[PDB]
Symmetry: C2
Subunit: 140 residues, 2 copies
Amino acid sequence: ATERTLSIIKPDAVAKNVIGEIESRFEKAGLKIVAAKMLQLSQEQAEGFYAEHKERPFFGDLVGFMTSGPVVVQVLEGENAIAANRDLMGATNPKEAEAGTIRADYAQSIDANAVHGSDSPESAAREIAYFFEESEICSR
Amino acid sequence: ATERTLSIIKPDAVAKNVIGEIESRFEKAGLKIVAAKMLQLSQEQAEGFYAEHKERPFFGDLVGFMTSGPVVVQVLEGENAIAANRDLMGATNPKEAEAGTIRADYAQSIDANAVHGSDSPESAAREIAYFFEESEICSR
C-alpha cells in the first residue's frame, strides 16, 4: 500500500553536499518527495523529536549531533514507503550496513549516519505531524 | 565572490521525480543548498513573483503552469553562484541550449522549462527575500 514516512538528511550528509545523490536513491526507487524543508534544528526541537529517548544516556549524542548543522526534513510517499525507506537507508550502523545503501555509501558512524527514517507506522504518523502539517504535504 | 541566488525546481521537474538529479548538478558544481522548501505555489504567490509579466498575454499560462503542481524553492550559495546557476540551467528555451544543461536534459518546452534561477544580483537578492527570511537561510 501507499504509505507516508519521515525522512531526514542529517547534518553530516548535508555538509557533504550529497543531498541530490540521496534524493535520487528515493526517487529512482519509486518514492516521491512530497514535503521538504531545510532548517537548523534548535535544541528544544531536536529533543521533542527524540522525546521517546528522553532518559537514555545517548540522548545527548543524538540531539547533540542533530543540531550540529542544517538538515533537510521531508516526507517520502509511495508503495510500502516506511519499510522501503529503511531498506534504502541500510542498518543504523554504517559498519553493519549493506553496501549500496545510503548509510554504507555516506555515513561514518552511528551518530553520524547519513539519514533518518521512521521505523514503524506509529513513528511515521508522529514524526510527520511533528515537522509538517497537511498543507505542507503535497501528495502526487 | 560567494553569492546567493534563488533556484526553483518547477512542477514539471518535480512531477518526473528528478529533484535529486537536478540538485546534484548544483552540488557537483560547487554550489550549496542553504535554504529549500517544497510548496504548492498559491495564485497570489505566483502572480507576485512574476508581477513583471502581469500585463503580458502569456501571464495566465505562466501562473497556471507554476501553480499546476508543487515546486522546490531554494537558495544556492557559492562563488559566482548567480551566473554559475545560469550556466548550469542553460537557456530559457530548451531548443537553444544543449550538451548537458538542466533545461536541455530535463525540459522540453520554454513553457515547461524545468528550473528557474535569478538572472541578476539585484533580482537575486529580492527573489530570495520574496520566499525566505534570513533565518531560513542556513549558510555553511
